[PDB]
Design the sequence.
């Protein structure tokens, strides 16, 4: 049975106007800005940007990669596909 999301979990994250995007739950470094309540820091592969999202916009990467893990014309998406598959926990 599923657990709550935790840092390091791999997802597709959905933002308005963007396709479901390869991303990870980030950790929060000591002394760094914390997310709002019930939000997670979402690191988007490829663009390397961070947004604060709730679980309603987070889809498990392994379950959904057949549906969402296809190349996309949007800037950074295909680099992001490489990152989530080949080095998803690296320092970016």
Sequence:
């Amino acid at each position: 049975m599923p657990h709550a999301f935790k840092p390091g979990d791999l997802v597709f994250a959905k933002m308005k106007g963007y396709p479901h995007w390869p991303a990870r739950i980030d950790d929060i470094a000591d002394g760094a800005v914390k997310p709002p309540p019930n939000k997670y820091p979402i690191f988007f592969f490829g663009t390397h940007e961070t947004a604060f999202l709730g679980p309603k916009d987070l889809f498990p990467y392994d379950k959904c990669k057949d549906k969402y893990g296809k190349p996309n014309k949007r800037k950074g998406f295909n680099e992001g596909l490489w990152e989530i598959q080949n080095n998803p926990h690296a320092s970016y």
